[PDB]
Amino acid sequence: AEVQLVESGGGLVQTGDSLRLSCAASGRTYTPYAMAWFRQAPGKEREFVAGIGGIDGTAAYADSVRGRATISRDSAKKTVYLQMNSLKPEDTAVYSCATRASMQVLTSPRVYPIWGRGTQVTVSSPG
Numbered sequence: 454a455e456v457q458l459v460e461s462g463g464g465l466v467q468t469g470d471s472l473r474l475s476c477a478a479s480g481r482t483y484t485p486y487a488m489a490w491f492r493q494a495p496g497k498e499r500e501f502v503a504g505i506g507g508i509d510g511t512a513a514y515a516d517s518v519r520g521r522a523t524i525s526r527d528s529a530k531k532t533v534y535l536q537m538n539s540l541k542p543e544d545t546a547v548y549s550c551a552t553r554a555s556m557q558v559l560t561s562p563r564v565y566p567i568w569g570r571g572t573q574v575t576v577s578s579p580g
């Protein structure tokens with residue numbers, strides 16, 4: 454593909470912890486285009502978590518992460534960040550970022566042609 458995505462910043466954490474995921478884009482990038490984080494637990498479909506697009510850096514969040522997540526981008530670093538706070542075991546999944554040749558952020562995975570590999574996020578009851 455003309456753009457490659459590589460996620461980092463996943464981890465193994467405890468309930469209540471924070472993690473900052475990063476998506477580093479390379480190739481023929483255009484930073485106002487929609488960047489969308491999805492997550493996928495085993496057996497389950499990928500679901501939208503958060504996304505950013507457009508000239509205002511407009512953020513959209515799934516109800517699942519209502520009040521716990523902040524998405525942002527740094528155009529000079531071609532990087533999108535997803536800060537997740539107050540993590541809980543139900544958040545465990547592989548998080549992957551995806552992009553498409555439009556500033557329009559959409560919640561369907563179907564409309565994104567370009568995907569990263571994913572990073573693992575595991576949240577366990579403290580111990």
Ligand SMILES: O=C(Nc1ccc(Cl)cc1)Nc1ccc(Cl)c(Cl)c1
Nearest residue numbers: 478482483484486531532552553554
């Ligand atoms: O480049 C991007 N997205 C992007 C978004 C934010 C940052 Cl910081 C960096 C890159 N998309 C894109 C670009 C070209 C094509 Cl063909 C397609 Cl299909 C998608």
